[PDB]
Design a binder for this molecule. Structure first.
Ligand SMILES: Nc1cccnc1Cl
Length: 165
């Protein structure tokens, strides 16, 4: 009934930075939200702990969740290698939106991105499934390690992650 909350404990070259928490919109996109929740707890035997934000573009997004190839070519969902676009009810309205990365229609895996700007050209193409709850300051700090081309100047990792409540 209550949308779940998950956290990421972020590190910068192995040094702790802070916590980002997310509300997952299970009420609107249950299949998508459940995939991110399970990858955040690791309860399927795989997920986000230890992975990297491999592409960070200030004034756009921070992207991660490639736990199999570490660079934006990999990842897998709890349902199989890929799963369908569940719906496009939610839009990319501003900083803090959490949305699925993809490589075409119906190719969702594990990769996701946190918006740091409104990205409305992504509406109807990427599935929105959550938002930052606490720690947008930590996202902003992450964002400073990115670059125009997305290569980070320090390694930004999810040192720990799981479900709150
Ligand atoms: N394989 C895949 C999945 C999600 C986003 N981008 C890619 Cl290339």
């Amino acid at each position: 009934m209550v949308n779940p909350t998950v956290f990421f404990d972020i590190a910068v070259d192995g040094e702790p930075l802070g916590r980002v928490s997310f509300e997952l919109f299970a009420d609107k996109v249950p299949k998508t939200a459940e995939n991110f929740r399970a990858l955040s707890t690791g309860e399927k035997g795989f997920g986000y702990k230890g992975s990297c934000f491999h592409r960070i573009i200030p004034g756009f997004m921070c992207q991660g969740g490639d736990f199999t190839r570490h660079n934006g070519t990999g990842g897998k969902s709890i349902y199989g290698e890929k799963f369908e676009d569940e719906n496009f009810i939610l839009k990319h309205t501003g900083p803090g939106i959490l949305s699925m990365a993809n490589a075409g229609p119906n190719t969702n895996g594990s990769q996701f991105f946190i918006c740091t700007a409104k990205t409305e050209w992504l509406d109807g193409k990427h599935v929105v499934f959550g938002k930052v709850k606490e720690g947008m300051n930590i996202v902003e700090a992450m964002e400073r390690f990115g670059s125009r081309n997305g290569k980070t100047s320090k390694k930004i990792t999810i040192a720990d992650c799981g479900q709150l409540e």
